[PDB]
């Protein structure tokens, strides 16, 4: 495999582009909720696939963007959508578009230390209520919390748990 | 239950009697009836008070008391300000039917 890595990024909020604004991203930490199963006879505790943790997507902005500050604390969830994009270049120039369409609720706004000479930062946080990662053009993750569809590589893994029982 | 109408004396029973049963509660002040002092509403005390957002919740809390006493066949749902002209506020008295 050729070495690839992130070179540039982008961010959309409800259609408009933050094409000169965002210095930082954080896609939500996908983590399975593990319960330690050690029992009679078995030596080491195994960890069991028993649901996902709380997804939360940080992003950051250096200027007062009215488009980003508009979506804090709205009475309807999933009014914020947001689209996070990356571009992974490879060794031979074959750039790979990593796009992550989330549809969460905007959770936290903290304009931090407004020192005079130092640039200011508006850290954001998004209580993610929908997540969908695409590596090149193909859909890798599709996380419905509120629905019963956890699609890994396009096939629902929660549907396979119901057929086993 | 079959009662008579207030005006014109006609005996009306089903649901026109239900509406005039409510409007005998809302427009009688307390103590105006003879030998029935705990009858009526405090809505005449709410007449000509400023329409705040605490005046609305004090009318909902007082219509529910006065209809809870002498109108058991009506479950009150909500009381809402729907328009304001000079002095004349008007309230959509909405409630489900029981009994």
């Amino acid at each position: 495999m050729i070495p690839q890595t992130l070179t540039n990024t982008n961010l959309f909020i409800d259609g408009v582009s933050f094409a000169g604004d965002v210095p930082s991203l954080t896609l939500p930490k996908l983590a399975v909720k593990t319960e330690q199963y050690r029992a009679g006879g078995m030596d080491a505790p195994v960890s069991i696939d028993m649901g996902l943790e709380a997804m939360e997507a940080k992003f950051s902005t250096n200027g007062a963007r009215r488009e980003a500050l508009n979506f804090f604390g709205l009475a309807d969830q999933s009014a914020f959508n947001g689209v996070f994009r990356g571009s992974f270049k490879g060794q031979k120039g074959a750039s790979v578009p990593v796009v992550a369409t989330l549809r969460g609720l905007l959770k936290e706004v903290d304009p931090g230390d407004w020192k005079a000479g130092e640039k200011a930062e508006f850290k954001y946080a998004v209580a993610v209520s929908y997540y969908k990662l695409e590596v090149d053009g193909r859909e890798v993750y599709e996380i419905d919390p509120v629905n019963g569809v956890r699609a890994i590589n396009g096939v629902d893994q929660l549907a396979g748990m119901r057929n086993d029982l | 239950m079959i009662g008579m109408d207030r005006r014109s004396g006609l005996p009306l029973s089903g649901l026109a009697h239900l509406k005039q049963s409510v409007e005998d509660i809302l427009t009688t002040p307390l103590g105006s009836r003879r030998m029935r002092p705990e009858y009526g509403s405090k809505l005449r005390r709410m007449v000509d008070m400023p329409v705040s957002e605490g005046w609305k919740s004090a009318v909902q809390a007082e219509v529910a008391r006065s209809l809870g006493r002498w109108e058991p066949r009506i479950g009150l749902s909500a009381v809402r300000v729907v328009a304001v002209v000079d002095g004349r506020v008007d309230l959509l008295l909405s409630g489900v039917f029981e009994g």
């Binding site: 259609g15 689209v83 369409t101 629905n147 | 007449v47 729907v82 008007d90 959509l92």
Partner: protein, 382 residues
């Protein structure tokens, strides 16, 4: 002259033309008497919400109000009601309902229901002519107006026997027609006897009750009719594919009021020649997602074609249709921009294509039950 005390008011106060559920608006055309008690000109549309609006705009004894009461007894519906002046010849009475451009620049009759939008924000989804649909000339008028309107026309057969209504359904097959032949009868206060209602407006109030309380994707057959008594024909019904007058009408693509003489409608297939478009829920979910797609995405006719614009709405629709998928309105779909037909030769012309492919939920009109018993894996007795 004001008043300074507590008062009761029995007249309407507030406006309810703000909500306007776009899937349940009804076009209505029948006769009335334009007197001084009916404050509406004949060949103009007028917006209706409650029975007080039908009482103010039309006469009580007029058959507009008899059709408005038939809808408003069941659902909190919105009606675009056009009137026609009653004629003498019944072949010329059908000429008044079809209307046309017989005026200078005014549409009359059924054609004024096309002017529902640009008057009252109601693009009508249910076409009913109560009584004036046993004639073929108006049922063909409601046919051809339906695909202009993207609605379905609830016509009705004659109140004669079954083969008089089966053969009346063989003149169609045009995907937009929902026929309910037994004209059901309703109790009257003044007559103190049994009336004769055409039972096409009762299916319109049942569709407005279905798409707002159960969703438009749900099949509006097995649900209750209010303001009803027995039918004009006792229509029997059994289970097991008999010679019943229920299975005879349903296999002829005709719906009918069936159980307990007035209790429920029964039947969901439309007058369609194609088996692909046999159900009304295939037809209703075809048009009520693709005008709900547009509602909210009204910005797609401006904001000219830049690089992100083709990409802006191709997950603008994917994010809206997954909201339709999660509430059950469809099952799994795909939304993607058209690769081959999109070109720069017609992108400067303004044309740019998107491909929508969704399958919808089937209505369970015939659930089978293969019962089988066992103990662990097989029939132990035999």
């Amino acid at each position: 002259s004001f008043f300074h005390g507590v008062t009761v008011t029995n007249v309407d106060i507030g406006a309810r033309t703000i909500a306007l559920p776009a899937s349940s608006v009804i076009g209505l055309c029948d006769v009335f008497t334009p007197g001084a008690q009916a404050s509406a000109k004949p060949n103009v549309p007028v917006l209706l919400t409650s029975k007080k609006d039908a009482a103010a705009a039309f006469g009580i004894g007029s058959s507009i109000y008899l059709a408005c009461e038939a809808i408003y007894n069941r659902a909190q519906a919105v009606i675009v009601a056009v009137g026609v002046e009653t004629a003498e010849t019944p072949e010329a009475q059908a000429s008044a309902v079809i209307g046309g451009i017989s005026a200078a620049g005014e549409r009359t009759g059924l054609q004024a229901l096309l002017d529902g939008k640009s008057r009252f924000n109601a693009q009508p989804r249910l076409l009913v002519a109560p009584g004036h649909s046993a004639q073929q000339a108006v049922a063909t008028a409601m046919d051809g107006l339906a695909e202009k309107l993207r609605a379905i026309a609830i016509l009705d057969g004659p109140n004669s026997t079954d083969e008089a209504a089966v053969a009346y359904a063989k003149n169609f097959g045009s995907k937009r027609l929902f026929m309910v032949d037994p004209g059901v009868q309703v109790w009257d206060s003044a007559t103190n006897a049994a009336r004769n209602a055409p039972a096409s407006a009762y299916a319109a109030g049942l569709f407005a009750w279905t798409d707002a309380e159960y969703g438009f994707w749900s099949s509006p057959s097995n649900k209750e009719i209010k303001g009803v008594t027995g039918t004009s024909r006792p229509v029997e019904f059994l289970d097991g594919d008999e010679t019943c007058r229920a299975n005879l009408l349903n296999n002829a693509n005709i719906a009918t009021i069936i159980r307990d003489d007035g209790y429920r409608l029964w039947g969901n297939r439309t007058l369609s020649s194609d088996s692909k478009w046999a159900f009304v829920t295939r037809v209703r979910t075809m048009d009520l997602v693709m005008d709900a797609i547009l509602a909210g995405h009204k910005w797609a006719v401006d904001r000219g074609i830049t690089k992100t614009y083709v990409k802006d709405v191709t997950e603008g629709l994917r994010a809206f249709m997954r909201d339709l998928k999660n509430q059950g309105a469809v099952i799994n779909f795909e939304v993607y921009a058209d690769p081959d037909l999109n070109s720069a030769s017609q992108l400067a012309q303004g044309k740019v294509y998107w491909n929508i492919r969704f399958t919808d939920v089937p209505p369970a009109e015939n659930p089978n039950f293969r019962v089988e018993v066992t103990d662990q894996w097989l029939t132990e007795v035999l």
